[PDB]
Amino acid sequence: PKQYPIINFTTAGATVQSYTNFIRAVRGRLTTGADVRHEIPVLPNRVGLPINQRFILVELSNHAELSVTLALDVTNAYVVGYRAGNSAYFFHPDNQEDAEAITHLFTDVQNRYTFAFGGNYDRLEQLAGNLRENIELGNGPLEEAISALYYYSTGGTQLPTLARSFIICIQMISEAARFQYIEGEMRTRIRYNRRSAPDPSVITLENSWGRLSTAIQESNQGAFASPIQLQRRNGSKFSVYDVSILIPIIALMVYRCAPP
Numbered sequence: 001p002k003q004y005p006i007i008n009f010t011t012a013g014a015t016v017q018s019y020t021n022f023i024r025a026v027r028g029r030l031t032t033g034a035d036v037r038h039e040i041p042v043l044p045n046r047v048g049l050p051i052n053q054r055f056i057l058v059e060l061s062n063h064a065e066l067s068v069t070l071a072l073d074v075t076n077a078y079v080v081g082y083r084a085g086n087s088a089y090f091f092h093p094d095n096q097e098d099a100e101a102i103t104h105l106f107t108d109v110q111n112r113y114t115f116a117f118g119g120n121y122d123r124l125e126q127l128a129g130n131l132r133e134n135i136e137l138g139n140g141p142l143e144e145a146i147s148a149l150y151y152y153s154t155g156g157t158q159l160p161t162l163a164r165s166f167i168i169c170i171q172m173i174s175e176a177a178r179f180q181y182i183e184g185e186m187r188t189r190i191r192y193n194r195r196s197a198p199d200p201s202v203i204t205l206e207n208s209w210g211r212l213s214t215a216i217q218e219s220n221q222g223a224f225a226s227p228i229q230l231q232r233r234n235g236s237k238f239s240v241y242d243v244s245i246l247i248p249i250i251a252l253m254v255y256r257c258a259p260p
């Protein structure tokens with residue numbers, strides 16, 4: 001339709017309800033082409049997906065009324081790049097096909113840049129000089145991340161702050177879309193007007209998203225080949241035998257194959 005779907009969100013006067021509707025809307029657009037036949041939605045297969053269905057845009061704004069737009073890949077719900085003003089910035093794609101795909105984003109803009117680095121946490125934590133466990137999430141942090149992303153395009157933001165801001169945005173949007181549990185953790189932060197880094201329960205879920213997507217889609221009648229290990233709020237390890245307990249926790253999965 002000329003442009004990809006746009007969801008708007010603002011930190012200005014943000015409430016639990018407004019964040020909830022925002023995440024609801026993002027999931028909606030992510031799952032237009034999803035396989036919703038089983039207990040957990042499966043995002044469209046990367047292979048053969050027409051380019052006009054490949055991305056969604058998330059436009060973020062704050063009290064300062066600065067605006068940036070993130071591009072998310074519908075196949076994994078992950079941020080691939082963003083726009084601020086007349087410039088767009090992309091994470092380093094892993095292959096030639098992904099590199100072609102992003103040429104279809106933000107075609108309007110004068111200035112296009114591809115970072116040397118990918119958008120995985122390991123690398124972003126390195127650039128930020130900060131682990132996820134010491135980077136606070138909440139409305140306040142998201143407000144500041146929006147400003148920092150905007151001012152990267154004017155020379156006002158240094159790369160470590162940019163990376164820290166991506167880590168914030170990805171967790172509060174992509175991971176909240178992927179995980180009802182993480183969305184809920186954000187709702188609590190918004191309710192009580194607090195900012196705090198994610199505990200190990202949030203972090204291991206984020207790290208386990210691909211593995212969980214795999215174990216679930218390769219399960220025998222919903223029971224797992226081998227158990228997957230997660231962490232509680234206090235760091236203690238437990239394991240999960242079957243999908244039952246994960247249906248309320250994971251909202252979307254990356255396409256995975258299945259056995260012979």
Ligand SMILES: O=C(O)c1ccc(Cc2cccs2)cc1
Pocket residue numbers: 181201230231232233234245249
């Ligand atoms: O006991 C806890 O603190 C705890 C246990 C499990 C999780 C992850 C899940 C929450 C609901 C189902 S699995 C988080 C925190």
